[PDB]
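Thanks for the sequence, V.! I ran Dihydrofolate reductase right away. Repeating your input here for the record:
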Amino acid sequence: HHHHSSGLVPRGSHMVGLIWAQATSGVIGRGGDIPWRLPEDQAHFREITMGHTIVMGRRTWDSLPAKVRPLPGRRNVVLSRQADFMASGAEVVGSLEEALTSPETWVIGGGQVYALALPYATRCEVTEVDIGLPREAGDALAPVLDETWRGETGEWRFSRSGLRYRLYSYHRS
Ligand SMILES: NC(=O)c1ccc[n+]([C@@H]2O[C@H](COP(=O)([O-])OP(=O)(O)OC[C@H]3O[C@@H](n4cnc5c(N)ncnc54)[C@H](OP(=O)(O)O)[C@@H]3O)[C@@H](O)[C@H]2O)c1
Ligand SMILES: CCc1nc(N)nc(N)c1OCCCCOc1cccc(CCCc2nnn[nH]2)c1
Ligand SMILES: [Cl-]
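Predicted structure:
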């Protein structure tokens, strides 16, 4: 069965969304990359963010596959404290306040930027990957979401590869 979910979330004059994929342990990144491959999550990330402003930390920009840098179809905003940073086809901003000026914004990583943006977020789109990768020194980590967050939990699904995952759609006022 499909998680008979409404999939509806009202919005106000500002919508700040966070979107990430995490292992059970909260690991989201390692060695400059994501330590699994999940086609359905790539498709999910693309469909949620298409047509919107996306905000990412400089290390997440570095981690994009060079052929989809900038991510097409989205206004790419890179957060860096390097005034001279070269992000061809994107814009570089020096502060989170300026990065979140678009009326709709999806924060797409990484660990540092999720943490700083979480107080302003009203949606979290989380892919939980059922992989038992323990946290290691240097890992990038997903935020811990408290009980101000509410929403819907999807059913477990298998990718054709056999990797198991599920989608959480969280929101708050
Ligand atoms: N699983 C997922 O969903 C997912 C999503 C995205 C990324 N990732 C992975 O996460 C890792 C990257 O995450 P990360 O935490 O190491 O780095 P990050 O959050 O992507 O980027 C950190 C950089 O962003 C800049 N920065 C951070 N806060 C800033 C602020 N308030 N103002 C201006 N600049 C700011 C700094 O750039 P400068 O050093 O240039 O000053 C900082 O070094 C990679 O492994 C990536 O593959 C995973
Ligand atoms: C996909 C990982 C991911 N998942 C979720 N749920 N949230 C994220 N923030 C997130 O990270 C995306 C930004 C960092 C890594 O970027 C990518 C890594 C591997 C492949 C692609 C191209 C995926 C297809 C595509 N998307 N847009 N055009 N094509 C991106
Ligand atoms: Cl992937």
